Symmetry: none
Subunit: 323 residues, 4 copies
């Protein structure tokens, strides 16, 4: 028996785990993700080619699809960051923080990309260019607190298959978009990432930019077990793709700080938090090298942190080296 995402969501709304309002939000998010998938797939055809330009259109489809729930503002990127869409329910009960695509690099989107989203229960209203100023950004950062009011997080990966991964806070559920019917079909319940995994995913091209602690860590992954097999290295360049592969097969994915990016590249609130919340629901761990990501409260407008994420035993191992 095939359960669609919509049926599953109406069942959760029927058992009262989620409200009607929240149900609407999730269902609209998944309708935006189907439209973005189609943009991503036809991009070569549509351009007759920038991942940055796609970033923008995707924010507009998001806005349209969540317009019946609330207003959407845009946190513009003056760096190489994706522009972030922030939706605020007309009601005040929910704020949705949406990364349309997971990078702005063509190179890193060659084979995969994905949207990332986090839904919060705010205690203040922040939304008044579609761009948000510094003041609205400050408000967002103070009201969205991953370690205390993050209710639901998910991603949609656009790659050889289109995969919607959700967690309202009870386990992780995987939904696969069926291309024949255009519906997201439940294909995995209570996904669990393995405890251990001999796969590491880092951009080893930056090794000479890393602290001595990390280098040793990396150098030892290449030592063959008594079994004679060293770790396997996989690194797509796509945050969702690489996260997704880790979540399923285990291992460790890392975006360390380096000599050029002194506090790392990933943003605490927009990228690291929704993914750390997912990996914890699946049984894994998200850390910055020393601390649990979701224990870091967001305090500043463009706060970045290093991220080590994946199988619990792989992440604990990195932290011993960095300690």
């Amino acid at each position: 028996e095939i359960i669609t995402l919509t049926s599953w969501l109406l069942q959760q709304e029927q058992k009262g785990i989620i409200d009607a309002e929240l149900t609407i939000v999730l269902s609209s998010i998944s309708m935006a993700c189907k439209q973005i998938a189609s943009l991503v797939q036809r991009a070569n055809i549509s351009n007759l080619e920038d991942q940055k330009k796609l970033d923008v259109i995707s924010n507009e489809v998001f806005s349209n699809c969540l317009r019946s729930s609330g207003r959407t503002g845009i946190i513009a990127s003056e760096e190489e960051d994706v522009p972030v869409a922030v939706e605020e329910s007309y009601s005040g009960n929910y704020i949705v923080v949406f990364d349309p695509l997971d990078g702005s690099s063509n190179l890193d989107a060659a084979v995969s990309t994905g949207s990332i989203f986090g839904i919060y229960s705010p205690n203040d209203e922040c939304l008044p260019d579609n761009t948000l100023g510094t003041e609205e950004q400050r408000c967002i950062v103070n009201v969205c607190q991953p370690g205390s009011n993050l209710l639901a997080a998910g991603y949609c990966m656009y790659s050889s298959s289109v995969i919607f991964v959700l967690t309202i806070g009870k386990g992780v559920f995987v939904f696969t978009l069926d291309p024949l019917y255009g519906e997201f079909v439940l294909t995995q319940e209570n996904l669990q990432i393995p405890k251990s995994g001999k796969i590491y995913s880092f951009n080893e091209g930056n090794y000479k930019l890393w602290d001595e602690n990390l280098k040793k860590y990396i150098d030892d992954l290449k030592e063959p077990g008594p079994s004679g097999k060293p770790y396997s290295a996989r690194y797509i360049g796509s945050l969702v793709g690489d996260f997704h592969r880790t979540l399923l097969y285990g291992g460790i994915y890392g975006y360390p700080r380096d000599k050029k990016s002194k506090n790392g590249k990933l943003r605490l609130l927009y990228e690291c938090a929704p993914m750390s919340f997912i990996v914890e629901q699946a049984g894994g761990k998200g850390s910055d090298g020393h601390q649990r990501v979701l224990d870091i409260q967001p305090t500043e407008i463009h706060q970045r942190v290093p991220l080590y994420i994946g199988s619990t035993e792989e992440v604990e191992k990195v932290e011993k080296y960095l300690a």
Copy 2:
């Protein structure tokens, strides 16, 4: 609608090529049936989590249905046999034209590993103009020995391509005169020409190797990887990208430049990739785009296949990156 633009489907594009007499009507039908098989393989890849919730290494079973899809789609052209997978290799389909004018060597999927097909995978094919017949559905030893003497990458390889199944479905084709890029239009069910005469950059600061094997490599290879990491005077080292999907990793290289490597190591003494099925069609595509395909010493396309599942190290990509690697291994 707006101003206007030209949408060339693959069919029209093949009919143009026939009209110019670059290719035959027969070849036209083969290349077109190959692309229909890829369109159906693309749908099977996309729905695999759903169809595994019934039926109607999961990457292994997909390998096998793909090969049936390929036989069924080329049935008006020839008969298809299968070269059974050796170890964890993908079974290879071999079709021979009823006319005896062509042989297609089709690798349904680029691996049998789930890890490596997590985000992308793809079909690889080679079309040869044989001197004999090798069947005119497992191919046995005799048929496998015939295929190897008749299919010569250095001389009768007329056309080579791949179809990548990733966030887009891309069909990359060369018929001997430049590399052409078709994008599958999911709305309309056709491939549309979206790039002509692709050229791979002459250089590119991107390397793609599985560095987890670094301690299993030779010291000359290790020195080359180590230097790539040195920040030049601008302070930028090379970037590392390794999907683990040969088609995915190759496609990225072809578009943005750089180097892809699958070396031999203490465990795979002759590399992993197979010469005839994987390296040869890919080297032919790269040379038509302006790059190089080497085994670390020699031009892959100058190596005569003499043993079915023969393997070779592969260094493919940007002309100067490849040259630089062969300088460290000499």
Copy 3:
């Protein structure tokens, strides 16, 4: 609110308390069966020899049963003649009964360009089916169902899904007529018109005039008079697909009048009262039009026989009233 899907619109009706969560799911499940029936109707030539409208009626009823499995059990009222077999779902809670016409006919001719499903949702006072062809309901379950579903008093919602050049889901939960268009790219029904109102007049008449020599003298005159060009010199336009859903949908949108009257051969009309006439009359009235049997309001008639039939005159209020004057 720019793009409102059917799931979101339903959840907003539930939030405003117009509907129940139970009904929300019954509705959303009906629409999924309609999505899959659409795809069957579209691919029907392929699925035979990449073709009978009769066979599609059967698979359509099984898709409906599968789609409504979590809400209740489904049985089938076997078709008397050339009538479509009707699926009947009884929610496990006893609160709702869904009466579903899978397709609007059993003829290929009449389904050459369009067909559609029709449903009515009733709030029952008793339990009919029980347990689980299986599907076929016996005489006794059938009578229960005809006794429990009373168009004039417990008919809560009704709709249809038309399968034509576009796929259109039309629904009324008691407060206006809402139109959802299937977005084939994204597999979802999207709100494309709210509170539809059928025009009060429209110079369009839809009847099978091959039957003219079989009709009664009062109706022949009415037909004959539509053909008189007026002072404007423009007589009425005749349109008649032969798809009940197609013809009704055109009528709802552009106005005019659709009729399937009694004749010498079919002494009481062809359309069934409960399965076809009632859901459509409730929709037309929610759009501000009229549904009559020529002398009386269809939803005032109580279904008393299993396959009871009635003549139907439906469409723009002024158009129905005019045929009603000629038949008095």
Copy 4:
């Protein structure tokens, strides 16, 4: 899928039944039609600033132009009247001219359930081509060079209804392809279609009865007589020329668009609508007449020439001809 349109085209080209050039053209047409099918299905959604049959006529002509731009230049014949603007493509080579009706009407009422694109491909004896409106003299050239009676090589339609069906004849019988909504490909579903020889179905706008000639009035009134069989003819009339025609093709019967007090010479246009459909019907074993003569015998002289049309099952059409004589 089983035999697809693209496979079937490439075999015909390979049997030398059609050029490569013409195979490109036919292929581009079916692409345009799969995009138009899409526009038609999603019109209600598109029209929410993100409905008029006339707007869609326009967009469909631009789709057609982009899909055929590789084969030749596209120009538009407008009728500021109630006719669909017609796109006319002329190969760059000068070997072919396609005349394409994007949709079969500009009325919303008549497009309520179905609509369709209609095309004829001609092998011209001169070049006519130079915001693609053709001027008068380009229109006059098209009309003298497209001669349904002698150089009309291939005709077809694509119906947009509950099914999307591409009907094509290249001069050897009529082939029916169904669009597969799962896979996006047109699949061959019917080879050598033959319209039945008779059919007790008549398709006319009978609202106009009091405006038809006395000869036509009695033919209408006779179809309503039950034979000794007790069954009169069945009336069906969608209002969509493609849909009414397609049902007649498959199930037999007759379709008519007669002349009347208002439309002295009928409403359908000879070259854009009547000719291509007459060619198809003939290939399927039926008849296409103006009530007195074979449609494809009439040579077009005027830009927007209209003709009464009676088409369908040979016996039914002969039967009407008998009452009009």
